[PDB]
Amino acid sequence: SIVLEPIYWQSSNSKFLPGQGLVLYPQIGDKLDIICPKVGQYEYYKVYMVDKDQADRCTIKKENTPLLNCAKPDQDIKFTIKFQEFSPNLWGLEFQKNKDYYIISTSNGSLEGLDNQEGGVCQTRAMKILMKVGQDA
Amino acid sequence: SAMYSTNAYAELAGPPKIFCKSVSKDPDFRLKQIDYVIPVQQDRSICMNNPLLDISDGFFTYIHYEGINSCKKSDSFKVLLSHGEIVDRGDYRPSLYLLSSHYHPYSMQVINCVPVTCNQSSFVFCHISNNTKTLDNSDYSSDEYYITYFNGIDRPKTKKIPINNMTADNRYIHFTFSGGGGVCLGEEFIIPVTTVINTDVFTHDYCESFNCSVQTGKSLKEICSESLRSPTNSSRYNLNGIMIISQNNMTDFKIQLNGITYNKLSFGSPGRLSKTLGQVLYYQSSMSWDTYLKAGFVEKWKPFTPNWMNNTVISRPNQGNCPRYHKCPEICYGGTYNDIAPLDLGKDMYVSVILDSDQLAENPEITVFNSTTILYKERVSKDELNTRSTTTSCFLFLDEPWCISVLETNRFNGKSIRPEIYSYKIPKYC
Ligand SMILES: *[C@@H]1O[C@H](CO[C@H]2O[C@@H](C)[C@@H](O)[C@@H](O)[C@@H]2O)[C@@H](O[C@@H]2O[C@H](CO)[C@@H](O[C@@H]3O[C@H](CO[C@H]4O[C@H](CO)[C@@H](O)[C@H](O)[C@@H]4O)[C@@H](O)[C@H](O[C@H]4O[C@H](CO)[C@@H](O)[C@H](O)[C@@H]4O)[C@@H]3O)[C@H](O)[C@H]2NC(C)=O)[C@H](O[C@H]2O[C@@H](C)[C@@H](O)[C@@H](O)[C@@H]2O)[C@H]1NC(C)=O
Ligand SMILES: *[C@@H]1O[C@H](CO)[C@@H](O[C@@H]2O[C@H](CO)[C@@H](O[C@@H]3O[C@H](CO[C@H]4O[C@H](CO)[C@@H](O)[C@H](O)[C@@H]4O)[C@@H](O)[C@H](O[C@H]4O[C@H](CO)[C@@H](O)[C@H](O)[C@@H]4O)[C@@H]3O)[C@H](O)[C@H]2NC(C)=O)[C@H](O)[C@H]1NC(C)=O
Ligand SMILES: *[C@@H]1O[C@H](CO)[C@@H](O[C@@H]2O[C@H](CO)[C@@H](O[C@@H]3O[C@H](CO[C@H]4O[C@H](CO)[C@@H](O)[C@H](O)[C@@H]4O)[C@@H](O)[C@H](O[C@H]4O[C@H](CO)[C@@H](O)[C@H](O)[C@@H]4O)[C@@H]3O)[C@H](O)[C@H]2NC(C)=O)[C@H](O)[C@H]1NC(C)=O
Ligand SMILES: *[C@@H]1O[C@H](CO)[C@@H](O[C@@H]2O[C@H](CO)[C@@H](O[C@@H]3O[C@H](CO[C@H]4O[C@H](CO)[C@@H](O)[C@H](O)[C@@H]4O)[C@@H](O)[C@H](O[C@H]4O[C@H](CO)[C@@H](O)[C@H](O)[C@@H]4O)[C@@H]3O)[C@H](O)[C@H]2NC(C)=O)[C@H](O)[C@H]1NC(C)=O
Ligand SMILES: *[C@@H]1O[C@H](CO)[C@@H](O[C@@H]2O[C@H](CO)[C@@H](O[C@@H]3O[C@H](CO)[C@@H](O)[C@H](O)[C@@H]3O)[C@H](O)[C@H]2NC(C)=O)[C@H](O)[C@H]1NC(C)=O
Ligand SMILES: *[C@@H]1O[C@H](CO[C@H]2O[C@@H](C)[C@@H](O)[C@@H](O)[C@@H]2O)[C@@H](O[C@@H]2O[C@H](CO)[C@@H](O)[C@H](O)[C@H]2NC(C)=O)[C@H](O)[C@H]1NC(C)=O
Ligand SMILES: *[C@@H]1O[C@H](CO)[C@@H](O)[C@H](O)[C@H]1NC(C)=O
């Protein structure tokens, strides 16, 4: 049980593969850091957890509430995941073996587009994460 | 007569006993796990979660939730209610004696429960609904609220609370019973509730006094206001409060629903009321932008007004925008309920089992502290132990301070999830 390579949430990251997204195979007990990088120019993001249907349709339902809201460019904002049952998260955010979790953002990257529900960098720049837990290739 | 014994339990109170009131590098808590009280499950897929424990007058009430492949309280098929006694086994330490266990009649419909032990009997206050989303899209007239009560000898009687006859101090569409426990003072029960309201009726002076980085394009006032909104339905606000219930032999109820003081409001989260040191303590979990311990003794009932500790050391983990030690106003949700028990007034001392981590839920450490500094601490396990909730109660057993804590633990990865109970002693010497 170890620390996976950190994932910076931004267009610059190579690990998002066009049409696919970032795909990971963490095992229960592992850590992963998702980071909203601080700063001449800045991207504004609201990062969410969704199921497959919504990840494919690149849409967020109104009830959802984000893991990360990065509206603050002057500071680094970090979300540390350990894959296990219990997290301080309000929804319960549980990680069980042999289950899949999707992380997307529908946002333009512009401050005016931070609250955008549909499309966004999920749809265009392919910012999506698929975490297959307790599984491998 | 050889059948008689003096009671080994007393409420921790009165002239301070002698124990370690200052810093200590390696304290001896005499920490022992109590594994015989809480049931064990044959099906490893059953998850026992969300433990609740109230100790009063030598007797205790335990509650937990059972659900399949789900540790969420909402997915629970069965909710377990336990009554018991605190006893001297000659162990040189307090013991839990389990008298009764029953499952809630309405378990499939249970939204939330809070225990209180009163007059040596267990009472449980429950919010029941045919609608799992009832706090988001519904109102309290559509739901039911019950008091289940029992003891060692008697079989459980569960009676319905005439909510129709209640009087509220504000206009609330909904409320739930939420927290680690309530109290009884005279003929009155007082139970922690989280209330729902449709209009922003609230002032945030405290929140507005902060100066630090906020989300661009948004005013501080906007943030402080919007931070009390249910993240599920932005048209609703969640405000903590209490329900006061008067009764005569479980008949002739008089019920009042009051909201908490508007001084330093925090987003509605599970709270607790407990009797200690001759006072009454209110605790509130920190589920929003202010991540430091939120607690205080109750200086006024109407409005319900705890005098908030100003505590610069104790905090809680959460992931993302408001991790541990984050004091800047934001719209963010999360955290862990880890309540506290007072040790000594004069020295302003408290125990709590707290999670030592910035983000992850793990590493419970028994911590003894004042507002300013941590006096002493010990990890509960030498191995990484995934734990979410924690509760702690304290009392005098044989004229010394003793504590019992329940931890909501996942020890074996993802399977046979069961909470752990612990008893431990406050060090006499540093
Ligand atoms: C809420 O806090 C923020 C930020 O936190 C501040 O907290 C205090 C406790 C200090 O620690 C402070 O340093 C923090 O920044 C605050 O906004 C900032 O306020 C500070 C002052 O408190 C201010 O810093 C100043 O910057 C000056 C810039 O001058 C430039 O030009 C000169 C030559 O002309 C050049 O040499 C400089 O390098 C700059 O390029 C600077 O001159 C000052 O330096 C002196 O003071 C320090 C501190 O004592 C001393 O150690 C040095 O030796 C110098 O003698 C000074 O540090 C910073 O610019 C503010 N940030 C902004 C504007 O973005 C808020 O207060 C401020 O609010 C508005 C009204 C602003 O106009 C400030 O006057 C005001 O103080 C604070 N909010 C409230 C309501 O108080
Ligand atoms: C939260 O809890 C902390 C810890 O319990 C309290 O802080 C302590 O307060 C006591 C006084 O009430 C302090 O005692 C003091 O000790 C000094 C010697 O220690 C110095 O050196 C250490 C290094 O080991 C430094 O860390 C420390 O800051 C000191 O500078 C003496 O100068 C004094 O002792 C005097 O009183 C005693 C009786 O108590 C006499 O017997 C002595 O002869 C002498 O006259 C001084 O009183 C202690 O240092 C503090 N510890 C800290 C700050 O870590 C907080 O007060 C408490 N918070 C609140 C809000 O109550
Ligand atoms: C976010 O939170 C808001 C605010 O609470 C919720 O909006 C409420 O939704 C409930 C039901 O979903 C509404 O309850 C209904 O009230 C009707 C009359 O009151 C108002 O209804 C309209 C609806 O928009 C208002 O605009 C208007 O001002 C009226 O004054 C009742 O007639 C309804 O009767 C229901 O129950 C009977 C049984 O008793 C059934 O026979 C009926 O078919 C019906 O189901 C009902 O009780 C409530 O009025 C709404 N309040 C508002 C809009 O302020 C949102 O639901 C919530 N959103 C989410 C996603 O959870
Ligand atoms: C966390 O931090 C907060 C912020 O400081 C503390 O709150 C202060 O607490 C002190 C002590 O309890 C309070 O001081 C008392 O004020 C009384 C008058 O209060 C006035 O305050 C409001 C302002 O909001 C006025 O508008 C209003 O009209 C009130 O009249 C005094 O009468 C008290 O005198 C006491 O001290 C003397 C000592 O010489 C005794 O002889 C007296 O008999 C009496 O006991 C007292 O000074 C102060 O008001 C609070 N400030 C606030 C709330 O902003 C919290 O107490 C602290 N938390 C903890 C747990 O300590
Ligand atoms: C727990 O025990 C306490 C005390 O042992 C119980 O308090 C009792 O509450 C009853 C109400 O049911 C009180 O009776 C009332 O007395 C007033 C006079 O002040 C009278 O005018 C009313 O009509 C009413 O009859 C009773 O006095 C009080 N006992 C004491 C000693 O104060 C409490 O009810 C118990 N809780 C339970 C059993 O849940
Ligand atoms: C929750 O709903 C029940 C009715 O539905 C029950 O039966 C099945 C359909 C199944 O969904 C089961 O889980 C569920 O509990 C309510 O009981 C009835 O409510 C109607 C309302 O008009 C009354 O007319 C009935 O008499 C009553 N049945 C009785 C009293 O036996 C129940 O009241 C409701 N509870 C809450 C808190 O809303
Ligand atoms: C009060 O409770 C006792 C308990 O057994 C019962 O015997 C008695 O009839 C009750 N009286 C009233 C007025 O409720």
What are the extents of the domains in chain B? Answer: 1-430
Closest CA to B287 of A89, A15, A16, A136: A89
Q: Using CA atoms, how far apart are residues A76 and A39, in angstroms rounded to an integer?
A: 9
Residue B351 is encoded by which pair of tokens? 């125990």
Residue pair B340/B349 in contact (Cβ under 8 Å)? The answer is no
Residue A94 is encoded by which pair of tokens? 């549980």
Q: A85 touching B, CB under 8 A?
A: yes
Closest Cα to atom 3 of ligand 7: B249
Q: Specify the experimental method.
A: X-ray
For B43-83, the three-class secondary structure string (H helix, E strand, C coil) is: CCCEEEEEEEEEEECCEEEEEEEEEECCCCHHHEEEEEEEE
Residue B96 is encoded by which pair of tokens? 């839990």
Residue B345 is encoded by which pair of tokens? 């007034």
Residue B249 Cβ inside 6 Å of ligand 7? The answer reads: yes
B chain contacts of residue A86, beta-carbon cutoff 8 Å:
71, 361, 386-388, 408, 410
Closest CA to B395 of B102, B146, B153, B60: B60
DSSP string of A107-127? --SSGGGTT--BSGGGTSS--
Closest CA to B316 of B356, B366, B274: B356
Q: B332 touching A, CB under 8 A?
A: yes
**How many residues does this entry show for chain A?**
137
Provide the pairing of β-strand B167-168 with B174-177. Answer: unpaired
Residue B128 Cβ inside 6 Å of ligand 6? The answer reads: yes
Q: Using CA atoms, how far apart are residues B315 and B337, in angstroms rounded to an integer?
A: 11
**Breaks (C–N over 2.5 Å) after residues, chain B:** none
Cβ A86–B319 below 8 Å, yes or no? no
Q: A92 touching B, CB under 8 A?
A: yes
Q: Using CA atoms, how far apart are residues B104 and B232, in angstroms rounded to an integer?
A: 28
Ligand 5 atom, smallest distance to B250 CA = 39
Residue A22 is encoded by which pair of tokens? 């970032």
Distance from CA of B416 to the nearest CA of A (A): 12
Ligand 3 atom, smallest distance to B136 CA = 61
Provide the pairing of β-strand B420-425 with B400-410. Answer: antiparallel
Specified resolution (Å): 2.8
Residue B27 is encoded by which pair of tokens? 């304290």
Mutate to test the pocket of ligand 4, among B294, B307, B312, B369 (most ligand atoms within 8 A of CB): B307
Q: Using CA atoms, how far apart are residues B130 and B108, in angstroms rounded to an integer?
A: 9
Q: A110 touching B, CB under 8 A?
A: no
Nearest-by-Cβ selection for B320 from A68, A74, A86: A68
Please name the amino acid found at residue A24: L
Residue pair B55/B97 in contact (Cβ under 8 Å)? The answer is no
Q: Using CA atoms, how far apart are residues B179 and B271, in angstroms rounded to an integer?
A: 5
Residue pair B72/B53 in contact (Cβ under 8 Å)? The answer is no
Residues framing ligand 5 (Cβ under 6 A): B 118-119, 184, 186-187, 248
Residue A29 is encoded by which pair of tokens? 């007990």
Left if phi > 0, otherwise alpha if psi is -120 to 50, otherwise beta: which for B414?
Answer: left
Segment B133-141 long-range contacts (CB within 8 Å, at least 24 positions apart) = B134/B174, B135/B111, B135/B174, B135/B176, B135/B196, B135/B230, B135/B232, B135/B236, B136/A63, B136/B230, B136/B232, B136/B233, B136/B236, B137/B233, B138/B174, B139/B173, B139/B174, B140/B172, B140/B173, B140/B174, B140/B175
For residue A101, the 8-state DSSP code is: E
Cβ A89–B334 below 8 Å, yes or no? yes
Mutate to test the pocket of ligand 7, among B249, B250, B251, B252 (most ligand atoms within 8 A of CB): B249
Residue pair B213/B244 in contact (Cβ under 8 Å)? The answer is no
Q: A90 touching B, CB under 8 A?
A: yes
Residue B307 Cβ inside 6 Å of ligand 4? The answer reads: yes
Backbone phi, psi, residue B222, to 5°: -60, -50
Please name every residue paired with B396 in a beta bridge, in sequence order, or none if there are none: B10, B401
Q: How many CB pairs under 8 A join A and B?
A: 99
Say which residue the tokens 């009560």 belong to: B149
Please name every residue paired with B85 in a beta bridge, in sequence order, or none if there are none: B59, B97
Closest CA to B327 of B218, B238, B211: B211
Closest CA to B287 of B259, B313, B321, B261: B321
Residue B295 is encoded by which pair of tokens? 């607690």
Asked if residue B303 has a cis previous peptide bond (ω within 30° of 0), the answer is yes
Three-state secondary-structure class, residue A21: coil
In which domain, by residue range, is A51 found? Answer: 1-137
Closest CA to B175 of B256, B79, B64: B256
CA dihedral of B161, B165, B167, B170, whole degrees rounded to 10? 80
Please name the amino acid found at residue B196: V
Please name every residue paired with B290 in a beta bridge, in sequence order, or none if there are none: none
Q: How many domains does chain A contain in total?
A: 1
3-state helix, strand, coil in chain A (%, to 5): 10, 30, 60
DSSP string of A74-100? TS-EEEEEE-SS--S-SS-----TTEE
Q: B319 touching A, CB under 8 A?
A: yes
